[PDB]
Symmetry: C2
Subunit: 85 residues, 2 copies
Amino acid sequence: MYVCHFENCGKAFKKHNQLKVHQFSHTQQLPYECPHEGCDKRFSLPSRLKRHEKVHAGYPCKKDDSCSFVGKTWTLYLKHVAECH
Amino acid sequence: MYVCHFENCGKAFKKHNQLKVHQFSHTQQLPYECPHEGCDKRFSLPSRLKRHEKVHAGYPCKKDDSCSFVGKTWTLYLKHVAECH
Ligand SMILES: [Zn+2]
Ligand SMILES: [Zn+2]
Ligand SMILES: [Zn+2]
Ligand SMILES: [Zn+2]
Ligand SMILES: [Zn+2]
Ligand SMILES: [Zn+2]
């Protein structure tokens, strides 16, 4: 089965095209797609997309796979790495 | 900055605890949490959680990291692997 990854859904469909058509119900409401290849993040406002693209530009913590820290600068990244985990 | 991973959000906070408090606004609306360790999936209905747990029990496609197929049976998994990608 093809399973919908959108939040609070998980509806499953026998055929891939049925999932794609279903998913239009989500993407219509979230027209602003992240331009990075492989990233499935979408938003309903341009400002939220822009904020998200700035996060891509930063320095994500990979010490912990649970950690949601993304440093705006290299200084703040190395400080985080030293003080956490 | 600590960045919120919930859909259509991405709000960022200087401190980890500020993100956690913010995230209560999401989790209050999605009370049904997946019991699998490492899985952040949440739902607003018990039926959606149950469906999601059944997906965990199945056979996820790992030929493609984009593919959303999860086989209900081993037969259907190997058929998918042969006919796709
Ligand atoms: Zn869906
Ligand atoms: Zn992105
Ligand atoms: Zn971290
Ligand atoms: Zn949020
Ligand atoms: Zn799960
Ligand atoms: Zn596949």
